[PDB]
Design a binder for this molecule. Structure first.
Ligand SMILES: [Cl-]
Lengths: 254, 255
């Protein structure tokens, strides 16, 4: 029985005003929630402020990316040691926006995963297939490759305490939609793939859905046995909507 | 005359403890400075804390990079609107570490310059030639090309109130250093290049030296007429050393 995790990826959205309002409203909307863990990833300059504002709540912090070095002559980079130092626990790596827009390779993302692991932070490893890969029936091949970049170079124990987020990139448009059954099939495949190396590790990995989640499909999605929560995008910017998703995850896994 | 600017590029160095200690020590060491402007660029997650620690001093804040979007579905990016909101003013763009390790193009860097000007922020445009380029006699061609990415798309007016930092990249990990005379010749070339388009704008541009600057060598660099300060790396992590540099710039440019 895995404790669910709902994480808000704020993407490139935030301000001093917005952080104060949204974190305060999240605390209020999440009052009484005990059965679903909650994390947020504001833009990096606001992590400190958000952590301090989250004091008194159960909201955990996180970040949207990390680089490979801990310190040194690396102007503009993000250090895992510094993310740990300001209080970010859940660090998104390999998001589709970075694999695409920033050409981040599977191997680079696996290096990120390793640095996070060495610092004692929790990677949120994003994986998923494109429109063409999905059409060609390559969903499993792609997800296995993206996972193997870590599994084959770092061992199954690399996944102890880790999170994977499955992004059905192929379903981004309003023309295509992933059903809970389709999502479940991919999550089961992911878990089964790790289980071939270590069944115990596979059992404890948190596999979040990273496709669009709303109040009308959350119950069904979270009703699936291998779906352990969600990495939420736009809905994370509105406290009421985000809390509905968190409560649905709590209700489903109780 | 041009009022000098000494800016500390902390690079990938910082922690809450380090920020508090360093900013406190900088406040003390720089409290008596009048004739040199000072900025610091901590790692992005520490800008807010550093800005709050600097309140009450003349230390200005800055950042080490920016991306192109103000907001939206751009996981992991840095927004100029957010840098403005948290209090950063001097934004380093095109640093040699980013042109090399992150393959940032002249054109990308010029787009970053434009977004910063749209937000009322001050670009610190880094330019400079590699070991191979220096060996090939292309110092001027390279600097001209990197500057032209902005000048030929946004005009000389884009350089109002802006800063340029010249990095002799050929001096990094080669065990060599540019002499003050060599640095001065490059700075005068950069200024003359902009002057071909607008002499007035060229006279007011702050052109910082971005090679290695140390408490020991700051005076000899700041004695040069077209060197208006420095973008300091390692010495920026020790308040005593950084203050010696600031004071050297103040003394060199003082009435
Ligand atoms: Cl110090």
């Amino acid at each position: 029985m895995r404790h669910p995790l709902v994480m808000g990826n704020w993407k490139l959205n935030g301000s001093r005003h917005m952080v104060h309002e949204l974190v305060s409203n999240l605390r209020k909307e999440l009052a009484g929630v005990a059965g679903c863990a909650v994390a947020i990833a504001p833009p990096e300059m606001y992590i400190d402020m958000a952590k301090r504002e989250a004091e008194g709540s159960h909201i955990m912090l996180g970040a949207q990316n990390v680089d490979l070095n801990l310190s040194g002559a690396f102007t503009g980079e993000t250090s895992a040691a510094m993310l740990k130092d300001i209080g970010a626990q859940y660090i998104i790596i390999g998001h589709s926006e970075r694999r695409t827009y920033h050409k981040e390779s599977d191997e680079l993302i696996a290096k990120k995963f390793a640095v996070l692991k060495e610092q004692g932070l929790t990677p949120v490893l994003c994986i998923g297939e494109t429109e063409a890969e999905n059409e060609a029936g390559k969903t499993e091949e792609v997800c296995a490759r993206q996972i193997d970049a870590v599994l084959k170079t770092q061992g199954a124990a690399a996944f102890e305490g880790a999170v994977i987020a499955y992004e059905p990139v192929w379903a981004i448009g309003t023309g295509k939609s992933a059903t809970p059954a389709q999502a479940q099939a991919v999550h089961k495949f992911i878990r089964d793939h790790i289980a071939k190396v270590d069944a115990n590790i596979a059992e404890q990995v948190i596999i979040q859905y990273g496709g669009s989640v709303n109040a009308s499909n959350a119950a069904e999605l979270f009703a699936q046995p291998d779906i352990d929560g969600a990495l939420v995008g736009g809905a994370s910017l509105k406290a009421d909507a985000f809390a509905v998703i968190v409560k649905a995850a709590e209700a489903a896994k109780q």
